[PDB]
């Protein structure tokens, strides 16, 4: 029913937490996304008081380059990130937002609860 779908998988590792994402074109048509900088996504890890614990974007510099990307019918754009410190046990939420903009598409974002144990 939705043309594009973003999935998030959060996996607790020994030294860190890993986030695997896949932006999937489920439509029958190719879809173009445009970006105004090199940055492809944003990822933010919220705690139970909605304070930010991690932001992919902090500590990074992106080129001010326009980009033009086509996701074919069925194609996925796969991407991941590592949060380099396990926090304390509890439930958290990761919100990934895709920075590419498709004509006649709401911006693509997903959220995902995950427990650190």
Swiss-Prot record:
Record keywords: Cytoplasm, Protease inhibitor, Serine protease inhibitor
Primary residence: cytoplasm
A Pfam family per the record: BsuPI
Cellular component annotations (GO), alphabetically ordered: cytoplasm
Gene Ontology MF term list: serine-type endopeptidase inhibitor activity
Keyword Cytoplasm found: yes
Subcellular localization, as worded in the UniProt entry: Cytoplasm
InterPro entries noted in UniProt: Intracell_prot_inh_BsuPI, IPI
Cited function: Directly regulates the major intracellular proteinase (ISP-1) activity in vivo. Inhibits ISP-1 in the early stages of sporulation. It may be then inactivated by a membrane-bound proteinase.
Name of this chain's protein: Intracellular proteinase inhibitor
Source organism of this protein record: Bacillus subtilis (strain 168)
């Amino acid at each position: 029913n939705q043309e594009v779908v973003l999935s998030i998988d959060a996996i607790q590792e020994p030294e860190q937490i890993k986030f695997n994402m896949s932006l999937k074109n489920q439509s029958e048509r190719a879809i173009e996304f445009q970006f105004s900088t090199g940055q492809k996504f944003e990822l933010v890890v919220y705690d139970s008081e909605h304070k930010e614990r991690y932001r992919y974007s902090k500590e990074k510099m992106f080129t001010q380059a326009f980009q033009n990307l086509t996701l074919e019918s069925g194609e996925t754009y796969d991407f991941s990130d590592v949060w380099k410190e396990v926090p304390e046990p509890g439930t958290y939420e990761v919100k990934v937002t895709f920075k590419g903009r498709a004509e006649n598409l709401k911006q693509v974002q997903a959220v995902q609860q995950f427990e650190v144990k």
